[PDB]
Amino acid sequence: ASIRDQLHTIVYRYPPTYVLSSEEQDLVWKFRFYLSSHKKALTKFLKCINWKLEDEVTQALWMLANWAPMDVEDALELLSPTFTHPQVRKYAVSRLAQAPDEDLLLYLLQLVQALKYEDPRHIVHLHGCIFNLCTFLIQRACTNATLANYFYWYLSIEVEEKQDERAHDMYAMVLKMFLKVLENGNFNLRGIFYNLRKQRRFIDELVKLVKLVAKEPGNRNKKTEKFQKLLAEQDMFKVNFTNFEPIPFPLDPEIYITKIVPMRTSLFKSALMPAKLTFVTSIAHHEYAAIFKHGDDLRQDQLILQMITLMDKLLRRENLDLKLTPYKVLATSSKHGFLQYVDSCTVAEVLAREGNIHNFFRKHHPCDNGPYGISAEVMDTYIKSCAGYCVITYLLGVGDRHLDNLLLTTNGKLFHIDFGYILGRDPKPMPPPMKLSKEMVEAMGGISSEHHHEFRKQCYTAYLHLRRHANVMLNLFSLMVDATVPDIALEPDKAVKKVEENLQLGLTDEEAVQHLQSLLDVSITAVMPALVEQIHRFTQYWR
Amino acid sequence: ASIRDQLHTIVYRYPPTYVLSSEEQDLVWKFRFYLSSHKKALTKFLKCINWKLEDEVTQALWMLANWAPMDVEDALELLSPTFTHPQVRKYAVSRLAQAPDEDLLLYLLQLVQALKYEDPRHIVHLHGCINLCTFLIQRACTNATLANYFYWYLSIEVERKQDERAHDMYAMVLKMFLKVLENGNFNLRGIFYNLRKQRRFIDELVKLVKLVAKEPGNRNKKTEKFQKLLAEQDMFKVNFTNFEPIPFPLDPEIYITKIVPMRTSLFKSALMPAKLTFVTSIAHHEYAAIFKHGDDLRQDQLILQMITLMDKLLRRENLDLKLTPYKVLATSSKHGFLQYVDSCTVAEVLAREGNIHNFFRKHHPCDNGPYGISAEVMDTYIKSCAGYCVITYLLGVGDRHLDNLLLTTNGKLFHIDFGYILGRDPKPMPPPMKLSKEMVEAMGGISSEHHHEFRKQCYTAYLHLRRHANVMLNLFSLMVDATVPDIALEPDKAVKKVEENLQLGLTDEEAVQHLQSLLDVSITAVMPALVEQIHRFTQYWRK
């Protein structure tokens, strides 16, 4: 019908986790038969059928075979715990199979959690065969070396020591099966297996060394000295850190390492003391650095970093480059991992060493002409980084921000780090909704500036695009409900709702921008002491 | 042609005071030939041609005469010093001829001011005889209320070294007008007889009032004296206890027979206003007015004309914000009349009845009513609030306090007194928007449905007025040499101050955002909970 279409388009194209559809179910259904407008339609169609009858199930399943094929993002929802039925799940797996590896890696973290939701019987039967989704992950991980790397590391965190007992047992089973398939396959499959073993041996020895450093009494500098001496001690360990045979790096399976440089290694002023390491690579003695951190479970951080990477990709697709830095994390075990090292200086360091951010930029990229005697791109990128981070931190509810927590680079970028507080948890009783240092606002030229205005403009458009891609972020959050990420595990059932609450999906675009602006304004006013003075004066007016 | 067609629609609909299109006006010239499309086309056309010297002129008039006739507002701009051509002004005055008497009444204040602009010759040759001055006179004679206001607006102005000659011109003009009335027919003679009747009365009331001031002492003492001077028959040229019916200078439709002495009271203000009760010719109806001896009232009367103009525009849009444009006229500098509306000051309401709701509750209590108040009173309150906030913002009205704002039993809120205009405040700060704390509680505070409607009403009033910006700007233009206190300090800046609050550069949503921002600061300042929250947010980055 003429209007019939709009009532339905709002349903295909707006609600994402809504149970909202009810009567709609009967109407979508009657129209379900004539027109599968979009893949988006299909996810919606699915919701009403499995509701009870088998007669309903048979008709719906046929509808599915012919329907315009779902997008991976929607397929993700299908692996979700809400839909029991074997045919829809086979279907979700077929949709992923169609996907390219790069896309598969992004989601993989979620797919590993997705495993929890499949029937154990499929997993036990495959175990029986060696001694769809699960067979699929193994089959594909074998196909491509970097995928295998991630698959392995994700499975290991899961396997190591109520319903947990059941889930651990399942993961243990997947790992034994994956490892046994690899040992057995050919040159290409065995090659993968040998490499994983080399990483496994290397990390264990690395862990032994860090523990010795941890034990040695002393301040940062004395411990770092002990750490440097240890690396250089050859054949005190099962591995010789000064030389080894090439091992694909767990953060980046693409780079082999072969060496560490004992004297280049530092420890962070951070309170857990991360090593930095340098390695050399298999190529032309290149360096890599990474961090190695031995205090917390990096899982919450990989989730957030995965989230930042995803958002960066979506904005980049729409031709919005907020110059974000989505660095790499893996955890090894809970309690160790790596993180990518990006050349950066924390804001507090910058403030203490140079008077203020502008001075810092100006030193690295002076341009007499302007904006502030700083080359424009640097100003432009600082502005974009700020807006991307401000919106992304708000959406994900990142708490516990401070001057140690934000960093800068020489190019301009700002980014965040250390995502221990997430989804509105904070060590302090307050917000602000938006997280901006007085220093960051001053860095922008203050309240009225070609640049500050530019910063707000960027937040709003960033916000609008992110809102549009709510389906993927929400589906991914849905799969992390039993995830063993601390902040999520406090009320698992509330986590997705909170992300969704921030997305402000009810509101119209014009309305949503006003909302962000509102949050932005309180935050900036409380941070700037003249604005607080102005409010003090206004109260004073009415007397 | 097509996109260039859009750039054309851009020039007509958007600005009234732009210097725009200098190299570009000849571009407008090119498509103007074929496109005397609509009225707004014209005002722009004239701006381009006339800047150049001698033949552009003859071509333009042929074009003008051929042009789809100009709207009356456009006409207002043509009277100004920006256009000095005799022909164009003739045309502008022909446009005025088209206008209804009511529209004339409105513009007539600015129309009187318009006279200051050329030509001096017209006045002197019409005087010699014994087309703008002529027009105004001819029409004053047609309409009795028109004539009334014309007379009063003239007599104030006749009561810098180069401003001294304008006075001369006003004088020449008033007397010509008065002479036409003397020499006129039955009807003109009648109006004239009535204007004179009004003078004597004004002078006799002035004498009485001066004598109340001459006596020194208490407020009760001065009222006693006032009552006695009114009751004293024939100690004055006019007997105030009863006199021959005269049309009220404030409201020419009403005639007055007498004043009631015992009913008169004096106002709280240090300079002490008198409230008079008048009896009218009809059904012993009574009229209440205020008579003020202290200050020149031209500033109050501009603001009220503007409030009245604005109300009409809104209501034409069928937005009735339930503003109250009480009529004001200044007889002379240092005395005039004010329409009186039965009202209670907000300070007065608050001291007498604890809070504002109690006041509304006293008069219109409904048990299922919002606040134990009738639903309609709460609505009329919200709307008046909204209306006034925006109008006050636009006109930059200062010196707001709780004696300045009064409430009716009906729920309307309105602003009483316009000492400070166009941004001037005795006090050093805004707030840009004026809301007492008590007013917001009266709405039931920020998290209420009424407060939301109030804001929603603000934005909407604002958007609409923006659309009618041209009328207001032109009205203001003709007020540059006005003899209003606040225009006189910065004549050149005055128009620009109103135009700036209109924010025409902004697109509609940006405009709404802008207004949200001002409302936000203004309301936070006032509410202590909102201030404390800012305290806590500031505290967040401290440690």
PDB file of C-alpha atoms in Angstrom, chain A residues 144-150 152-153 188 190-203 244-259 279-283 288 290 330 332 338:
ATOM      1  CA  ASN A 144      44.758 -18.264   6.933  1.00  0.00           C
ATOM      2  CA  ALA A 145      47.674 -17.866   9.336  1.00  0.00           C
ATOM      3  CA  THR A 146      46.780 -14.573  11.016  1.00  0.00           C
ATOM      4  CA  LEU A 147      43.170 -15.777  11.661  1.00  0.00           C
ATOM      5  CA  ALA A 148      44.631 -18.921  13.262  1.00  0.00           C
ATOM      6  CA  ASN A 149      46.781 -16.695  15.458  1.00  0.00           C
ATOM      7  CA  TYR A 150      43.811 -14.831  16.839  1.00  0.00           C
ATOM      8  CA  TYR A 152      44.208 -19.549  19.128  1.00  0.00           C
ATOM      9  CA  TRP A 153      44.854 -16.726  21.514  1.00  0.00           C
ATOM     10  CA  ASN A 188      50.547 -25.275   5.432  1.00  0.00           C
ATOM     11  CA  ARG A 190      51.461 -27.959  10.295  1.00  0.00           C
ATOM     12  CA  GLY A 191      53.407 -24.769   9.640  1.00  0.00           C
ATOM     13  CA  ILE A 192      50.702 -22.891  11.549  1.00  0.00           C
ATOM     14  CA  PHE A 193      50.935 -25.389  14.389  1.00  0.00           C
ATOM     15  CA  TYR A 194      54.696 -25.082  14.709  1.00  0.00           C
ATOM     16  CA  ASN A 195      54.455 -21.285  14.800  1.00  0.00           C
ATOM     17  CA  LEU A 196      51.801 -21.206  17.490  1.00  0.00           C
ATOM     18  CA  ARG A 197      54.059 -23.454  19.557  1.00  0.00           C
ATOM     19  CA  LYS A 198      56.995 -21.084  19.129  1.00  0.00           C
ATOM     20  CA  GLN A 199      54.875 -18.156  20.342  1.00  0.00           C
ATOM     21  CA  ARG A 200      53.604 -20.300  23.230  1.00  0.00           C
ATOM     22  CA  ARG A 201      57.138 -21.214  24.299  1.00  0.00           C
ATOM     23  CA  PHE A 202      58.349 -17.661  23.857  1.00  0.00           C
ATOM     24  CA  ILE A 203      55.629 -16.057  25.978  1.00  0.00           C
ATOM     25  CA  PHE A 244      66.109 -16.430  18.529  1.00  0.00           C
ATOM     26  CA  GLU A 245      64.561 -18.153  15.543  1.00  0.00           C
ATOM     27  CA  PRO A 246      61.826 -16.086  13.786  1.00  0.00           C
ATOM     28  CA  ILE A 247      58.439 -16.137  15.447  1.00  0.00           C
ATOM     29  CA  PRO A 248      55.297 -14.430  14.156  1.00  0.00           C
ATOM     30  CA  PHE A 249      54.469 -11.714  16.655  1.00  0.00           C
ATOM     31  CA  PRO A 250      51.164 -12.326  18.473  1.00  0.00           C
ATOM     32  CA  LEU A 251      50.077  -8.680  18.128  1.00  0.00           C
ATOM     33  CA  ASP A 252      51.000  -8.887  14.471  1.00  0.00           C
ATOM     34  CA  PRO A 253      51.352 -12.360  12.947  1.00  0.00           C
ATOM     35  CA  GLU A 254      52.627 -10.661   9.809  1.00  0.00           C
ATOM     36  CA  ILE A 255      55.967  -9.618  11.307  1.00  0.00           C
ATOM     37  CA  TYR A 256      58.437 -12.209  12.463  1.00  0.00           C
ATOM     38  CA  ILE A 257      60.625 -11.210  15.371  1.00  0.00           C
ATOM     39  CA  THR A 258      64.128 -12.625  16.020  1.00  0.00           C
ATOM     40  CA  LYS A 259      65.779 -10.435  18.681  1.00  0.00           C
ATOM     41  CA  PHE A 279      62.444  -6.299  18.852  1.00  0.00           C
ATOM     42  CA  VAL A 280      64.233  -6.606  15.685  1.00  0.00           C
ATOM     43  CA  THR A 281      62.325  -8.200  12.855  1.00  0.00           C
ATOM     44  CA  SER A 282      63.269 -10.680  10.171  1.00  0.00           C
ATOM     45  CA  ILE A 283      63.480  -7.753   7.748  1.00  0.00           C
ATOM     46  CA  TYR A 288      59.113  -3.145  16.297  1.00  0.00           C
ATOM     47  CA  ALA A 290      55.547  -3.427  21.837  1.00  0.00           C
ATOM     48  CA  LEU A 330      45.967  -8.933  22.557  1.00  0.00           C
ATOM     49  CA  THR A 332      47.918 -13.580  26.215  1.00  0.00           C
ATOM     50  CA  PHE A 338      50.724  -7.114  24.608  1.00  0.00           C
TER      51      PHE A 338
END
